[PDB]
Design a protein around this ligand. Structure first.
Ligand SMILES: *[C@@H]1O[C@H](CO)[C@@H](O[C@@H]2O[C@H](CO)[C@@H](O[C@@H]3O[C@H](CO)[C@@H](O)[C@H](O)[C@@H]3O)[C@H](O)[C@H]2NC(C)=O)[C@H](O)[C@H]1NC(C)=O
Lengths: 245, 215
């Protein structure tokens, strides 16, 4: 069994987009199908379901009136029409096969050539809501964003980021698109005690990450600390001074 | 827009047993079959259990499940490192939208290293960001094992739901884990409270950091 989703991409709020899913290696028109989505780092969520024949349709409350599932059994294709897209529709969209076949219960055969079965006379089986095969999914990112280099804000060392002895300071790399950025300190001369965290995709559809470094609190008056931020998609390189308080 | 509640994480040593609960309501689990899905890191889900206790052909008898009243339970015995994954329960019925739901998901961790307690660092909004009419609190969590934390935010002593964005834990170079949580506030919200706190729970122990507009 093989399911291959397509149609995803970056799209602005309020627009429309149609996802597709192509089925292979099973009898597509004998099985119901599902769409399931997963926002980045979050849980699975039902989106829509459709009977093997395309007649019965079911949609999740969050998408009522905006999304419509459909299928074309002459093309082994499942569709999801997504209108009036919202930032909270950002997610990986999975296509999934339903378990229960519209299984033939009575069929005749070519009398002499009885390896050839004739069109099914009677069948039964509808949607049971068990997703037995899943595609790898297609990503849909809803955001107003165009290629954008980051804003950088200092995370200043204070009495509340000191324990000792040691002080913590950092920079907040805010509102860039797309991934990735790289961060260094003092043009690469400071590497001990540095930690750069993976980004979060914000509901605004822009990324943010932070980088923090632990240093002697005695040094805060003598040593300059500068965080260097590279964003290749926008060809920007920025340096930000981080000083107390 | 209902949910089946699951524990955020469970863990055990190799060869041991874990259970994962799935708590719902009469409308979903109470009247319907429960199914379970396994999702390995970076992969698509795979069906584990259907019709409450039935295994598809490839699934070993180390996995079993049941239900009682409005709650379902998955059990994994002889736990092995390959079982590390997120596990989701689910119900689906044609009758009502509220019977079509997935659980919140449970990460199963197989413990192959000693526990390590997180370092937590909390930063307030910078003056520069506030001059731009925005405010972000930054809670950074590093050097912990196993790789699961929950983060809660408080304004004074009141829980804050809106504005929180938290990353999934990611393995560091030393094979421990890191994560971060961001609370987006307006300047007014930041300045109008006596303090904000980030509360990090790791293996049932909660540690807390606090920052205040008046430094
Ligand atoms: C399981 O589902 C049932 C309903 O399917 C839930 O029971 C009902 O919960 C709602 C809240 O979403 C209650 O409605 C509220 O009632 C109060 C009191 O009259 C009213 O002030 C609100 O305007 C709102 O309408 C409802 O009373 C309550 N009971 C029934 C019989 O529907 C239940 O909370 C769910 N969870 C469980 C049982 O754990």
């Amino acid at each position: 069994v093989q399911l291959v989703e397509s149609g995803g991409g970056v799209v602005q709020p309020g627009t429309s987009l149609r996802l597709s899913c192509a089925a292979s290696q099973f009898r597509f028109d004998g099985y119901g199908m599902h769409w399931v989505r997963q926002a980045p780092g979050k849980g699975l969520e039902w989106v829509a379901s459709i009977s093997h024949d395309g007649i019965k349709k079911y949609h999740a409350e969050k998408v009522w009136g905006r999304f419509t599932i459909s299928r074309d059994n002459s093309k082994n294709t499942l569709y999801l029409q997504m209108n009036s897209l919202r930032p909270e529709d950002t997610a990986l969209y999975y296509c999934a096969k339903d378990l229960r076949e519209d299984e033939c219960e009575e069929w005749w055969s070519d009398y002499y050539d009885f390896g050839k079965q004739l069109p099914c006379a009677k069948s039964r089986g509808g949607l049971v809501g068990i997703a037995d095969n899943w595609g790898q999914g297609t990503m849909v990112t809803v955001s107003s964003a165009s290629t954008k280099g980051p804003s950088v804000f200092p995370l200043a060392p204070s009495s509340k980021s000191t324990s000792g002895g040691t002080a913590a300071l950092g920079c907040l790399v805010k509102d860039y698109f797309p991934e990735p950025v790289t961060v260094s300190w003092n043009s690469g001369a400071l590497t001990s005690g540095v930690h750069t965290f993976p980004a979060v995709l914000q509901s605004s559809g822009l990324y943010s990450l932070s980088s923090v470094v632990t240093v002697p609190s005695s040094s805060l008056g003598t040593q300059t600390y500068i965080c260097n931020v590279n964003h290749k998609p926008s060809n920007t390189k920025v340096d930000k001074r981080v000083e107390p308080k | 827009q209902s949910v089946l509640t699951q524990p955020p994480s469970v863990s055990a040593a190799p060869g041991q047993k874990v259970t994962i609960s799935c708590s719902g309501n009469t409308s979903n689990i109470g009247n319907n079959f429960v199914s379970w899905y396994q999702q390995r890191p970076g992969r698509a889900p795979q069906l584990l259990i259907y019709e409450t206790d039935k295994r598809p052909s490839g699934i070993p008898d180390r996995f079993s499940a049941s239900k009682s009243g409005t709650s379902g339970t998955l059990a994994i015995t002889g736990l092995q490192t390959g079982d590390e994954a997120d596990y989701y329960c689910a119900t689906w019925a044609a009758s009502l939208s509220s019977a079509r739901v997935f659980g919140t998901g449970t990460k199963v961790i197989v413990l192959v290293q000693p526990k390590a307690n997180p370092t937590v660092t909390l930063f307030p909004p910078s003056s520069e960001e506030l001059q731009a009419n925005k405010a972000t609190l930054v809670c950074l969590i590093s050097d912990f094992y196993p790789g699961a934390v929950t983060v809660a935010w408080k304004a004074d002593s009141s829980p804050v739901k809106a504005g929180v964005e938290t990353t999934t834990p990611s393995k560091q170079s030393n094979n421990k884990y890191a994560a971060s949580s961001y609370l987006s506030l307006t300047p007014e919200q930041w300045k109008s409270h006596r303090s904000y706190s980030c509360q990090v729970t790791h293996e049932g122990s909660t540690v807390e950091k606090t920052v205040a507009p008046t430094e």
